[PDB]
Enzyme design. Structure first.
Site, PDB file in Angstrom:
ATOM      1  N   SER A 176      -7.266 -10.773   1.619  1.00  0.00           N
ATOM      2  CA  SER A 176      -7.626 -11.965   2.392  1.00  0.00           C
ATOM      3  C   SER A 176      -9.159 -11.927   2.645  1.00  0.00           C
ATOM      4  O   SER A 176      -9.696 -10.894   3.095  1.00  0.00           O
ATOM      5  CB  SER A 176      -6.828 -12.027   3.709  1.00  0.00           C
ATOM      6  OG  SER A 176      -5.428 -12.392   3.507  1.00  0.00           O
TER       7      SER A 176
ATOM      8  N   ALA B 199     -17.635 -10.174  12.501  1.00  0.00           N
ATOM      9  CA  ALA B 199     -18.794 -10.059  13.405  1.00  0.00           C
ATOM     10  C   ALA B 199     -18.623  -9.013  14.507  1.00  0.00           C
ATOM     11  O   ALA B 199     -19.592  -8.372  14.924  1.00  0.00           O
ATOM     12  CB  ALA B 199     -19.164 -11.432  14.017  1.00  0.00           C
ATOM     13  N   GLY B 200     -17.398  -8.884  15.010  1.00  0.00           N
ATOM     14  CA  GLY B 200     -17.012  -7.752  15.824  1.00  0.00           C
ATOM     15  C   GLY B 200     -16.802  -6.545  14.929  1.00  0.00           C
ATOM     16  O   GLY B 200     -17.162  -5.411  15.317  1.00  0.00           O
TER      17      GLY B 200
ATOM     18  N   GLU C 101     -10.010 -19.333   4.398  1.00  0.00           N
ATOM     19  CA  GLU C 101      -9.448 -18.176   3.720  1.00  0.00           C
ATOM     20  C   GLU C 101      -9.418 -18.367   2.231  1.00  0.00           C
ATOM     21  O   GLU C 101      -8.888 -19.389   1.752  1.00  0.00           O
ATOM     22  CB  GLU C 101      -8.028 -17.834   4.194  1.00  0.00           C
ATOM     23  CG  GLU C 101      -7.586 -16.481   3.544  1.00  0.00           C
ATOM     24  CD  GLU C 101      -6.385 -15.802   4.181  1.00  0.00           C
ATOM     25  OE1 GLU C 101      -5.983 -16.148   5.296  1.00  0.00           O
ATOM     26  OE2 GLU C 101      -5.842 -14.882   3.556  1.00  0.00           O
TER      27      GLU C 101
ATOM     28  N   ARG D  72       0.833  -1.232   0.000  1.00  0.00           N
ATOM     29  CA  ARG D  72       0.000   0.000   0.000  1.00  0.00           C
ATOM     30  C   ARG D  72       0.849   1.255   0.000  1.00  0.00           C
ATOM     31  O   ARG D  72       0.651   2.158  -0.846  1.00  0.00           O
ATOM     32  CB  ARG D  72      -0.896   0.024   1.233  1.00  0.00           C
ATOM     33  CG  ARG D  72      -2.078  -0.883   1.123  1.00  0.00           C
ATOM     34  CD  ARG D  72      -3.199  -0.487   2.099  1.00  0.00           C
ATOM     35  NE  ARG D  72      -3.146  -1.281   3.310  1.00  0.00           N
ATOM     36  CZ  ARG D  72      -3.555  -2.545   3.372  1.00  0.00           C
ATOM     37  NH1 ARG D  72      -4.027  -3.150   2.282  1.00  0.00           N
ATOM     38  NH2 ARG D  72      -3.472  -3.213   4.511  1.00  0.00           N
TER      39      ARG D  72
END
Ligand code: VO4
Ligand code: VO4
Length: 210
Positions: free
Chosen positions: A133, A143-144, A173, A50
């Site tokens: 990923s 979910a968190g 994955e 990045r």
């Protein structure tokens, strides 16, 4: 006239299906080792990709070697189905201006933040310098997380089920190549307002060695 993307709902058959693709990859030892190295240092590798806008010439030599092995390993790794893939992200995913700005004290997302997110991203292409990923299902790892992206990845696309190659891979994955572009089609809040749901069509990668 939208296309149909499968969503896996049965972990057991999601693994069987992923295993079944994997057993056909025919990856070399070197490609498996590069995947293992990616899973061990993914945040670092994607962070370097990045920061450097996908140019790898300045990376340490062993890393260049691993990245080119990984890039080329996708020649062997395609999905034979239109599949939905999932990931969860933290606010910085939307930009640093969103990092400390997105959520409320109850843990719901900020409507006015979310409104800003859309104008910036909705109906636009996004280029990702890192590898992506994802998971074959909406696993607990997320979910968190307050941002769930559902990527629509078409038959024949580069996409690798790496969960059986490395014990440090995510559950189910599915790895997507770096330097990929996707189009954000939809952004809406969850039912219990804790999550921004992003639906995007994966357009594919610029990295095609060979
Ligand atoms: O074992 V290798 O043929 O991947 O160098
Ligand atoms: O200085 V190196 O690119 O051989 O680690």
């Amino acid at each position: 006239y939208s296309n149909t993307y499968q969503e896996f709902t049965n972990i057991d058959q999601a693994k069987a299906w992923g295993n079944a693709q994997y057993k056909k990859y025919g990856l070399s030892k070197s490609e498996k080792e590069a995947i293992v190295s990616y899973t061990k240092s993914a945040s670092e590798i994607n962070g370097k990709l990045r920061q450097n806008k996908g140019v790898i010439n300045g990376f340490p030599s062993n890393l260049i070697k691993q990245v080119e092995l990984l890039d080329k390993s996708f020649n062997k790794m395609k999905t034979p189905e239109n599949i939905m893939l999932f990931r969860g992200d933290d606010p910085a995913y939307l930009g640093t201006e969103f990092q400390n700005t997105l959520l409320n004290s109850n843990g719901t997302i900020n409507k006015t933040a979310f409104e800003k997110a859309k104008a910036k991203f909705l109906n636009k292409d996004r280029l990702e310098y890192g590898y992506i990923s994802t998971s074959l299902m909406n696993v607990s790892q997320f979910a968190g997380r307050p941002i769930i992206t559902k990527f629509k990845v078409a038959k024949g696309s580069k996409a690798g089920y790496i969960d059986p190659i490395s014990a440090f891979a995510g559950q189910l994955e599915m790895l997507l190549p770096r330097h990929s572009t996707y189009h954000i089609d939809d952004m809406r809040l969850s039912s219990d307002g804790k999550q921004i749901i992003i639906t995007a069509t994966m357009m594919g990668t610029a990295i095609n060695p060979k």
